[PDB]
Amino acid sequence: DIMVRLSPEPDLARVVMDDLLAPSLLDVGDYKIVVEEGLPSGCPCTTQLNSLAHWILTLCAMVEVTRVDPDIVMQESEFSFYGDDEVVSTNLELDMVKYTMALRRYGLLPTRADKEEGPLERRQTLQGISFLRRAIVGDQFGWYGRLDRASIDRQLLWTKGPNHQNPFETLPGHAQRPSQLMALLGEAAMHGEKYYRTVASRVSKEAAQSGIEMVVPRHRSVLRWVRFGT
Amino acid sequence: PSGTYAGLPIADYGDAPPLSTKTMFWRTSPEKLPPGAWEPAYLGSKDERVDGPSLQQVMRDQLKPYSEPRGLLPPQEILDAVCDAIENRLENTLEPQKPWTFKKACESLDKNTSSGYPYHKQKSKDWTGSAFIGDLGDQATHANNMYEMGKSMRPIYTAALKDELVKPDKIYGKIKKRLLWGSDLGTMIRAARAFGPFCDALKETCIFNPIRVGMSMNEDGPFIFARHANFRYHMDADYTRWDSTQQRAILKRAGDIMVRLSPEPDLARVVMDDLLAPSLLDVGDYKIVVEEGLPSGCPCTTQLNSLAHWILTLCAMVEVTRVDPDIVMQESEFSFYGDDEVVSTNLELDMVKYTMALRRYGLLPTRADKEEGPLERRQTLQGISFLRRAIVGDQFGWYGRLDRASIDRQLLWTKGPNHQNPFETLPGHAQRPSQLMALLGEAAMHGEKYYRTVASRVSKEAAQSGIEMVVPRHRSVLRWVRFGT
Amino acid sequence: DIMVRLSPEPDLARVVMDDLLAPSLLDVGDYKIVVEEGLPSGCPCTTQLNSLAHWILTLCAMVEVTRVDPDIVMQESEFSFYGDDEVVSTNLELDMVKYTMALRRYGLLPTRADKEEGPLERRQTLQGISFLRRAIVGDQFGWYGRLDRASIDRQLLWTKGPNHQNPFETLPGHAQRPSQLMALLGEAAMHGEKYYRTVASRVSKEAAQSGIEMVVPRHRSVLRWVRFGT
């Protein structure tokens, strides 16, 4: 409803929007089945429309529970959505027992992060919450998102290439991993000297057998590049 | 199916469309061609200059020597000695490249020319000034994956007959017509990726290294030939049926070097190992198997071929002279472009033993530019030729000048659309501004008198003509060709 | 006479040239004076006109001595000229006594390039002559002009700067070092390994405590940039 009304062509956008939401047709090999429900996640718009719903579902719960009108909640809160991924920040004194119910009651399925169990927890720090799969971290210089070391490590163990049947198969030098390789250093240097140095272990070797060779940067040197850019 | 086509095994059915019964050449005057004048090659059963064998048959004729017993390998002790020397020299000269992208490889290809197996579409039919879509697109994609993955593909070469001007005999005597191998786009881009960096390296050291592929006769000529002149003895060595007489064993030796100087060697090994594996050739009705000789389709091959050449020659010299190939190669300047060679050297070379060596390898030199041998060598660099140009010893330096008789032709014939009868006149041509110029400058270097008779012909060839152009003065244009830019 | 003939405004050149050659006025401070002879050497074209005379003078003797038509000698000879700077190569059998005598008669003062004495010797080897204070050298790859040891030694020991009265003074961290300092790196490669190491360091020494850091490429890696390219 919202996106159509907000589009330069409401008359036309409506016909298209009705089409998406109409009980959907999903080709699953042997058949095309009718999917009446959930989200039809094909199209371009989709992920925006998806987040838009998430906005609508979070707000409803907050208003249902706190009983403050939705403009005041929203002037008292900072929201972050991306499809299903979400941070919800508010000064309002929200009942977490009462909240989770409303959510579940709408048929949603919230879990206590990857810590298991509730009611959902609230905290008075932002540290620890994450978003787009990076850790939300704050220091003397401001806030930033930091892809965690476990997550960094895998990227060292796997590289993308053409479709094949055995995952343990190794490529050649693969002469197009300098872009990706650089980021890894950046990501690492935000975990202090100890770590970055042992990521300086691997990013070194896997640079020998590759298309070109450059020298590995200094920590403080790359951390700056990483934090304030560019 | 099975199992013998012109001396060679059958492996499968062919998919090659039929041979061109047509020429691209067209006459410039209706005037009756001079006596003994070159003409486009024979065009089969519909050709009207003669009734002769099928093109099918002509091609069988061309395939005879691929089945011939191969010649012998150079002595093992001399073979490695050289090969290790050649690579070290490249290593001391070649600027290391950065790997060729699909993007780059897809760009390199001569877009005006058949796709090969299996669509057989001219490449332009499917390109976007950008990348291959549709048919070739898919073909181009698949091969690229097989590259990065270091997995293998079987080249499928298509066979053709070169449309060119030939000595009239080769129409009215024993009909001959030269064989070409069309590569398939898969092998094409694949080899382009694998071996493009190397060829580029070669390009940008073609004056310092004997492999002159990519050179400019005009810009680079005066200094390549200047290096040659720095040596006492010079020799034509003129080879018959180079590509057919080749030994894969040596093609593998040049393959090894090439692969050794490639950015992604492991990826390159495969491509080579394929290129060199017994070649499948698509000759119309049947695909057959060519185990020996040089498979000529893809990029690379010409540098590959010269590189082999380099080896063979360097072998004979070490074989005969008894000298370490480093010294030979430092008492000598070479020039190879495919089979076209010129060898300049300070070492007294026993011409009898030397020729013998080459023949023993299963090569076929004829006599320099006369009849019968022992091969011979001169004290002077004039008289030798290369890339169809006579090397000239001028006060302003050395150069390449296209011979009189070669000019007469380029004035007698013009390239156009494909037609049935070479003798028709191309109704009021347009495209000559560049080509006319060059031949006017070619004739420039043959003196003031020759230039006049040319100028006039140029002009009535500028009669019914697209651009009403000036004949510049001789002095002026002679300045223009020699010195540049 | 030649320069004018072969210039697009001959009429007007005739003047400037007739001007440029007329008994010349030279301000030495106390007085301007008249110099009627020798080269008047301030003008853009100056060095070409002077080269042009060197040619004329070289041929004049050569032709006198061999007694062959000057254009013939020019097709049995190759010449390089740069003001007073020459290399004369030839297939003509040339009498070194009479040649020396012929020039010293034109009033020239040649000498034996490396042993300071005439008649001028003539060797069978292009190696050991210099041109533009680089020495002619030939290896298995071809010929090249190389700058010698002492000159490259001198180029490290000193550097340009603004005007000053005492030359042992040292300015701060000279920033226009790199673009040159690299070339020095180049020109020493051509003396091979041992020496190149000797320079490789002296280069490190400075450039670090100057602009940024220097990459000191491997000896064989410069040789290729230096000899071949690019």
Swiss-Prot record, chain B:
Record entry for activity regulation: Inhibited by Suramin, Suramin-related compounds and NF023. Inhibited by PPNDS.
Transmembrane segments: none
Domain of life where this protein originates: Viruses
Catalytic activity: RNA(n) + a ribonucleoside 5'-triphosphate = RNA(n+1) + diphosphate
Organism: Norovirus (isolate Mouse/NoV/United States/MNV1/2002/GV)
Binding-site residues, Mg(2+): 236, 238, 340-341, 385
Domain RdRp catalytic: 232-353
Cofactor: Mg(2+); Mn(2+)
Name of the molecule in the record: RNA-directed RNA polymerase
Subcellular location: Host cytoplasm, Host perinuclear region
Subunit structure: Homohexamer; also forms fibrous hexameric oligomer. Interacts with the viral genome-linked protein; this interaction induces the multimerization of the RdRp and enhances its activity.
Highest classification ranks of the organism: Viruses, Riboviria, Orthornavirae, Pisuviricota, Pisoniviricetes
Cysteine disulfide links: 298-300
Free-text function comment from the UniProt entry: Replicates genomic and antigenomic RNA by recognizing replications specific signals. Also transcribes a subgenomic mRNA by initiating RNA synthesis internally on antigenomic RNA. This sgRNA codes for structural proteins. Catalyzes the covalent attachment VPg with viral RNAs.
